[PDB]
Structures are given as C-alpha cells and as structure tokens.
Short mmCIF file of N, CA and C and ligand atoms in Angstrom, two decimals:
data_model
loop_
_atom_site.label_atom_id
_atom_site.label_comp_id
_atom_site.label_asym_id
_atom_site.label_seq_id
_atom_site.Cartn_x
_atom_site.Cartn_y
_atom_site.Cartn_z
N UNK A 10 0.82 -1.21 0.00
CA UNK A 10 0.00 0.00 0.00
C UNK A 10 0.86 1.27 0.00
N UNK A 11 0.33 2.26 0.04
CA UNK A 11 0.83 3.61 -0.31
C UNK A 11 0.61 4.29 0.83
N UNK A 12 1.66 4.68 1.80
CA UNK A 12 1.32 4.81 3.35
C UNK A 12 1.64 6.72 3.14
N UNK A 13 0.58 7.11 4.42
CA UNK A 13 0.82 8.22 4.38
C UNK A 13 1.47 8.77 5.78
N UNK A 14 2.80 9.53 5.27
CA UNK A 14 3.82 9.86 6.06
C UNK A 14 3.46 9.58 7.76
N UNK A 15 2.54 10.40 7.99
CA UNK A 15 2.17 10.65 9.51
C UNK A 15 1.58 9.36 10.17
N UNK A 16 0.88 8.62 9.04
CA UNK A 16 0.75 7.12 9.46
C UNK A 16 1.80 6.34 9.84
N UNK A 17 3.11 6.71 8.88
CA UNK A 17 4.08 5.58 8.92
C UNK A 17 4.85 5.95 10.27
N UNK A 18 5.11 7.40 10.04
CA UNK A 18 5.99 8.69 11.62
C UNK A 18 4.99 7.86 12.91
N UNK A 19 4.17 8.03 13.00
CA UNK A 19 3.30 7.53 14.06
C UNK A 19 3.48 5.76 14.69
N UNK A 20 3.90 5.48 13.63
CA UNK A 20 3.71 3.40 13.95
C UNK A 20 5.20 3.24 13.91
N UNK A 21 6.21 3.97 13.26
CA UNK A 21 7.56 3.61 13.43
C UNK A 21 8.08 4.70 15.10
N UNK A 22 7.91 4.90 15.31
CA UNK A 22 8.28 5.99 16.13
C UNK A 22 8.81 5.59 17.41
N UNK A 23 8.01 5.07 17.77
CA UNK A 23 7.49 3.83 18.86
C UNK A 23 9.03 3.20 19.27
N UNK A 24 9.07 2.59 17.93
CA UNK A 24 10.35 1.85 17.54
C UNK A 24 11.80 2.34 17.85
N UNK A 25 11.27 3.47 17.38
CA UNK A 25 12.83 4.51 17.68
C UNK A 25 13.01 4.76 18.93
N UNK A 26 11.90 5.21 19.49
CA UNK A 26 11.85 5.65 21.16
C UNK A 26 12.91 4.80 21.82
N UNK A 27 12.35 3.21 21.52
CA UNK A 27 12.75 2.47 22.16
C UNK A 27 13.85 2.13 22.18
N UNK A 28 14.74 2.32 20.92
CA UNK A 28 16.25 1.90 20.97
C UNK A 28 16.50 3.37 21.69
N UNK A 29 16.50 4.33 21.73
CA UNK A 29 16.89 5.65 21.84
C UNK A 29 16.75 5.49 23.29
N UNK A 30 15.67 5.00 24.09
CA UNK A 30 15.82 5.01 25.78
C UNK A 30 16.71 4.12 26.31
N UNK A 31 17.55 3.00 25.58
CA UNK A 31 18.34 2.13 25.89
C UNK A 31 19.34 2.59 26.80
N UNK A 32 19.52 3.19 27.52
CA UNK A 32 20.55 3.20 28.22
C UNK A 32 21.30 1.94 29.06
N UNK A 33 22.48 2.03 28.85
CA UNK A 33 23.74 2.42 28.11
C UNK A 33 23.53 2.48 26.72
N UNK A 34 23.28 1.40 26.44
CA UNK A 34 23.38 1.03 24.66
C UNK A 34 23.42 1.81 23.52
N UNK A 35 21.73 2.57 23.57
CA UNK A 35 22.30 3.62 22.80
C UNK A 35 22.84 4.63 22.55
N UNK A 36 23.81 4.89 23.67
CA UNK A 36 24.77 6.09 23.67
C UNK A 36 25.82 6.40 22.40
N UNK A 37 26.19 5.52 21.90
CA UNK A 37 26.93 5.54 21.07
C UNK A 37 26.50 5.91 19.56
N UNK A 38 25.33 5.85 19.40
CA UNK A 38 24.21 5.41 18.22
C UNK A 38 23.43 6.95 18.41
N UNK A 39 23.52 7.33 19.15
CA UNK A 39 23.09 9.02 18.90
C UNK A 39 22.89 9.90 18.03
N UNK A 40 24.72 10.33 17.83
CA UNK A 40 24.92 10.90 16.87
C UNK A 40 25.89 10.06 15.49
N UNK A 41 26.16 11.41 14.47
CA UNK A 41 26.84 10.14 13.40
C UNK A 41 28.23 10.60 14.34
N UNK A 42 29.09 9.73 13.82
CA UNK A 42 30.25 9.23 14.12
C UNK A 42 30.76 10.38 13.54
N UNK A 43 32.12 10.80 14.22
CA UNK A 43 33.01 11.91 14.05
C UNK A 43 34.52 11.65 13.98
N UNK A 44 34.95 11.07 13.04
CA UNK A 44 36.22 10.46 12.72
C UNK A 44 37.66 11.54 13.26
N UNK A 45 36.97 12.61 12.95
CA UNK A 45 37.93 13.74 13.11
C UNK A 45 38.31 13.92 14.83
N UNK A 46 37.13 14.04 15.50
CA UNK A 46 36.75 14.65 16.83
C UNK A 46 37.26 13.32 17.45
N UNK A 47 36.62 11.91 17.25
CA UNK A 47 37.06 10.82 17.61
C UNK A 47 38.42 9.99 17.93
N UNK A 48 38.97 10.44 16.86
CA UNK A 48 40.70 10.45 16.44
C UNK A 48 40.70 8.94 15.85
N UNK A 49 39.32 8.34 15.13
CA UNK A 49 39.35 7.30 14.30
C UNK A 49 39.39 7.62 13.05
N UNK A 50 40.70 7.95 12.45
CA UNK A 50 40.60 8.23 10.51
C UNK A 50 39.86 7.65 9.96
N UNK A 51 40.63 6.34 10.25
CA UNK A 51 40.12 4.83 9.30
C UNK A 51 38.39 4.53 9.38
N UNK A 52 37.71 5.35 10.08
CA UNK A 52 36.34 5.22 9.70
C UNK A 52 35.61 4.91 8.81
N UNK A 53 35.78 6.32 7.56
CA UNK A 53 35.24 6.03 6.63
C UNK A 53 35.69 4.84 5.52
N UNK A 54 37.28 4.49 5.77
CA UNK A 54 37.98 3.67 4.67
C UNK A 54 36.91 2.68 4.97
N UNK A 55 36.47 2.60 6.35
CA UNK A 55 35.78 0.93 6.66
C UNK A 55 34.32 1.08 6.22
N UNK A 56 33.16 1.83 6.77
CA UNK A 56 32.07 2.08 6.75
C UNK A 56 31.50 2.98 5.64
N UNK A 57 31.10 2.55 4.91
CA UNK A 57 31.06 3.40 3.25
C UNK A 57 29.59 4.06 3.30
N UNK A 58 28.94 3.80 4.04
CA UNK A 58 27.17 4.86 4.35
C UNK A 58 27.49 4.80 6.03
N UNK A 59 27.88 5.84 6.46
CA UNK A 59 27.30 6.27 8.05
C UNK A 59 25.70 6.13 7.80
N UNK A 60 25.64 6.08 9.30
CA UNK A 60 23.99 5.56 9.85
C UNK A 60 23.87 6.09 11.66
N UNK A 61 22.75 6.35 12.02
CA UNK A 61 22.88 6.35 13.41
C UNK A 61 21.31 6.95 13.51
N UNK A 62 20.71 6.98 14.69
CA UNK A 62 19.51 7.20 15.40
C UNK A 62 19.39 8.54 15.06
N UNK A 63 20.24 9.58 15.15
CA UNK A 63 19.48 10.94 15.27
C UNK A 63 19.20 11.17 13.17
N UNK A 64 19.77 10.87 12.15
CA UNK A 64 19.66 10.65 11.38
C UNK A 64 18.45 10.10 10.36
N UNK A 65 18.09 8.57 11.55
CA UNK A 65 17.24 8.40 11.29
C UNK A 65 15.67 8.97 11.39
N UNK A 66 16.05 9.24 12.49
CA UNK A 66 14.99 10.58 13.37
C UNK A 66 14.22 11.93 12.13
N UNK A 67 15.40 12.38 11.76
CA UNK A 67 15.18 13.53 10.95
C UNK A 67 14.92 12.56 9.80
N UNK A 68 14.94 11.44 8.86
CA UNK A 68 14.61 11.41 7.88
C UNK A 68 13.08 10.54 7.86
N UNK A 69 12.82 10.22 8.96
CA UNK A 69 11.41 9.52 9.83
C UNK A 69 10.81 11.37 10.11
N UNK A 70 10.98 12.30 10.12
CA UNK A 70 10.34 13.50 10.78
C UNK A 70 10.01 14.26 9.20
N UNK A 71 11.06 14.07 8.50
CA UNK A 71 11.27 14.69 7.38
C UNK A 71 10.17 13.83 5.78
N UNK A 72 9.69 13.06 6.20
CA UNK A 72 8.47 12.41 5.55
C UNK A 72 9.62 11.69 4.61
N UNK A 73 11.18 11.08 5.00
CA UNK A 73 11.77 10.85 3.38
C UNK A 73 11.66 8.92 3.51
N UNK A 74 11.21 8.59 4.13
CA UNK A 74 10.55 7.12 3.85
C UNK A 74 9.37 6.93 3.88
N UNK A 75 9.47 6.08 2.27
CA UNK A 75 8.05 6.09 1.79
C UNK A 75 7.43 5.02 1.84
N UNK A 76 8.36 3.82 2.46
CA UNK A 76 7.97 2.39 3.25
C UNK A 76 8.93 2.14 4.12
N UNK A 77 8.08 1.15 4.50
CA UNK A 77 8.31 0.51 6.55
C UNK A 77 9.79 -0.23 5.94
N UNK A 78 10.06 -0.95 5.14
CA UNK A 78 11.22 -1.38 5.06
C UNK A 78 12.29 -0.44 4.63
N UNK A 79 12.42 0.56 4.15
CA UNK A 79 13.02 1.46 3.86
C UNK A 79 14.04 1.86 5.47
N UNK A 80 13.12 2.17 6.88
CA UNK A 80 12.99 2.29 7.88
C UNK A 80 13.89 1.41 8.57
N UNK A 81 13.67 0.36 8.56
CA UNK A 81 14.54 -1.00 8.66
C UNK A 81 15.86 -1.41 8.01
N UNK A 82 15.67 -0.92 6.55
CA UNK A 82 16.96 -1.21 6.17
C UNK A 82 17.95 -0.11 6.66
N UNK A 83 17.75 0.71 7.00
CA UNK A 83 18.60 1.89 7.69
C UNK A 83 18.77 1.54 9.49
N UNK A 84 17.98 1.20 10.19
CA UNK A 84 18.09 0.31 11.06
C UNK A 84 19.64 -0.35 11.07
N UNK A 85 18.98 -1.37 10.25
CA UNK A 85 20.12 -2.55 10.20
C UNK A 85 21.49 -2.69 9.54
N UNK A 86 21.78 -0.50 8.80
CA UNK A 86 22.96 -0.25 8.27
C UNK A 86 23.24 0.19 9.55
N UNK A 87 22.62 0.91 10.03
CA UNK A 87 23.81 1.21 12.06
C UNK A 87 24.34 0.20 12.15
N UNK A 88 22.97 -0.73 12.38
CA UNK A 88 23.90 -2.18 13.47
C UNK A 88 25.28 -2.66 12.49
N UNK A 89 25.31 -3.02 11.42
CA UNK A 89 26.14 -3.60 10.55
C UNK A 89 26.77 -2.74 10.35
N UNK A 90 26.97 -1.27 10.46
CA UNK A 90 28.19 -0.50 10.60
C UNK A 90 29.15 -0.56 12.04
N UNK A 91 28.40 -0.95 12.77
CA UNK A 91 28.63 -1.00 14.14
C UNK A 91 29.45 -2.00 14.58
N UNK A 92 29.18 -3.78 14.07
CA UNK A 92 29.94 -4.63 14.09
C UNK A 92 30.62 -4.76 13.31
N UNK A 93 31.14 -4.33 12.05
CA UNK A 93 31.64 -4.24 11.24
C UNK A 93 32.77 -3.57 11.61
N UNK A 94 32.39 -2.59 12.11
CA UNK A 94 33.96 -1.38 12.38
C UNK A 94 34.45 -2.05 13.63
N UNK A 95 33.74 -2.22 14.59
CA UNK A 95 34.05 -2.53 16.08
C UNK A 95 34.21 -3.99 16.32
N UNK A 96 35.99 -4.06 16.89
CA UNK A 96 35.53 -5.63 17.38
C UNK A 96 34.37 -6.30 18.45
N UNK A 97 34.36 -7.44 18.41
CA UNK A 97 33.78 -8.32 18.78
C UNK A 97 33.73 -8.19 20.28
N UNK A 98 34.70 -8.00 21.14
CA UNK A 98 35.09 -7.91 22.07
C UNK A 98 34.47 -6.26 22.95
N UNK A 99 34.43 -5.61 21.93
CA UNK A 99 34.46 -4.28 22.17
C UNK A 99 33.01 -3.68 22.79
N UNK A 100 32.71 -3.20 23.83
CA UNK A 100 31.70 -2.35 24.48
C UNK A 100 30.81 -1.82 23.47
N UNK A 101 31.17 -1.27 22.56
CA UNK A 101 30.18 -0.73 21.31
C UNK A 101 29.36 -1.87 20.69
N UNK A 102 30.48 -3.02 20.40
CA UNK A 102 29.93 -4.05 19.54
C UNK A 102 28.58 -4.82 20.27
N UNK A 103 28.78 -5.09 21.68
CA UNK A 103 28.27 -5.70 22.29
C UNK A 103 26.59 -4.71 22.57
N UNK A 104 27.13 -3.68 22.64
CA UNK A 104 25.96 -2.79 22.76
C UNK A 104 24.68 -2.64 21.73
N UNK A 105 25.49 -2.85 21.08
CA UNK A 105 25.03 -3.17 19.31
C UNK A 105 24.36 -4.34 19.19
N UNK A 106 24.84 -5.23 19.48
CA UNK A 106 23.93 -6.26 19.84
C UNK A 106 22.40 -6.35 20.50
N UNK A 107 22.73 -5.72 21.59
CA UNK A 107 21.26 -5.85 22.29
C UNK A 107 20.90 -4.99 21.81
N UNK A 108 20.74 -3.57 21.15
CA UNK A 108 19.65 -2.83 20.38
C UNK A 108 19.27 -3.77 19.54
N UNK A 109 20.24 -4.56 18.81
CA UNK A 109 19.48 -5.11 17.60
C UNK A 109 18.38 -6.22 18.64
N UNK A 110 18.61 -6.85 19.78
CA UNK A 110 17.69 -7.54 20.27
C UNK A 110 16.62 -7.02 20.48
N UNK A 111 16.37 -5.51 21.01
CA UNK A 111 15.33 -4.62 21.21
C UNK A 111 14.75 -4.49 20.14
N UNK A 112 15.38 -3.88 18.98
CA UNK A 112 14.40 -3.79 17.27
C UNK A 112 13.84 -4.77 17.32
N UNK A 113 13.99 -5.88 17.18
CA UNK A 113 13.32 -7.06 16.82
C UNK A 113 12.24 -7.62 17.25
N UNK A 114 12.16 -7.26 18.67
CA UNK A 114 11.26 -7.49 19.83
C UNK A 114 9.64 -6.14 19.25
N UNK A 115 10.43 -5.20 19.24
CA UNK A 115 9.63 -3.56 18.54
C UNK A 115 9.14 -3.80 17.48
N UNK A 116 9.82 -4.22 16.42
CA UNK A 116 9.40 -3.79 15.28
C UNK A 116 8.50 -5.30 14.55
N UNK A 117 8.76 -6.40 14.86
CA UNK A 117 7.96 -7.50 14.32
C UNK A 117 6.24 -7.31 14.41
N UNK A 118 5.86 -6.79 15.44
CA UNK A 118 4.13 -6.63 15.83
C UNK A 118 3.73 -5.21 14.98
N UNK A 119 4.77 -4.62 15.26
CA UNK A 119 4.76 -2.98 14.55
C UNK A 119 4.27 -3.73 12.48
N UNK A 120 5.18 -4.01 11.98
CA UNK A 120 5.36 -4.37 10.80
C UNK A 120 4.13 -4.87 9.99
N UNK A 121 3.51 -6.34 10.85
CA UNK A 121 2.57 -6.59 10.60
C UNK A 121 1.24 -5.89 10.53
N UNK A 122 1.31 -5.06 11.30
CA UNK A 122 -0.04 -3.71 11.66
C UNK A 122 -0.01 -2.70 10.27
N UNK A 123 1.09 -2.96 9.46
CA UNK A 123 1.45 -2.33 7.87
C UNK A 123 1.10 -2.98 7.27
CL1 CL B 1 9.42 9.26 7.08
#
C-alpha cells in the first residue's frame, strides 16, 4: 500500500523511542560518528554509508521514507556498521547487539499492523 507519512511517523516511532531510551546502549548510536573529533581516521575507509539514530529521526520527521522497510533497512545499516567497524570484544559491539535484540522485539508486531 501507499502509506501516508504521519501514518508511517506515528507506527515507526514507537520503535525509535525504544532503541533511543536504551541506556547504556544507545549512547553511542546518537549521533553520526566523528572520525575527526574521535581520532578514528580509518572510519570512513571501513564504513562506506554512516547511519545512526538521530539521522534516522530527521529522515522519519522529514516524511523521506516512503515504506516501513526502507525504515529498517537503515536500522540494520547502524547495526552492521557497528559490528563491522568494532571488534567483537568491544563495548560498542556488544551494545550493538542488544539494540538489535530490542528492534526485533519492537518492530515484528509494529510491521505486521502495515
Ligand atoms: Cl518518514
């Protein structure tokens, strides 16, 4: 179907809240990543589309997804930028993890209601 913005802002939202109240977790996932400020160069060599929550926020506010998977696949470029750059071992990575456990939990009942 052909969803209209404030429908979709309204039923995804929810979703966002919820990774966004994660504390600790989503601390990191805030803002985009700052390679410069950070003193990580090698950022971008690794991660070829930055992604992060406040991003998503403005393009969920900004009417620029025009489906629920659209929403999701940006979702799941954080997380996969996230383990991707960050080892395994690493506080970020791990953090990364359980948001993605939270989306999943959020967004499956959400999805179907589309
Ligand atoms: Cl949107």
């Amino acid at each position: 179907k052909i969803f209209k913005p404030e429908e979709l802002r309204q039923a995804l939202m929810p979703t966002l809240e919820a990774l966004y109240r994660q504390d600790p977790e989503s601390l990191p996932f805030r803002q985009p990543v700052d390679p410069q400020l950070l003193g990580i160069p090698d950022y971008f060599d690794i991660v070829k589309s930055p992604m992060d929550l406040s991003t998503i926020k403005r393009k969920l506010d900004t009417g620029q997804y025009q489906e629920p998977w659209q929403y999701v696949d940006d979702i799941w470029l954080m997380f996969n930028n996230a383990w991707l750059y960050n080892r395994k071992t690493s506080r970020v990575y791990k953090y990364c993890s359980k948001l993605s456990e939270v989306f999943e939990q959020e967004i499956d009942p959400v999805m179907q209601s589309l």
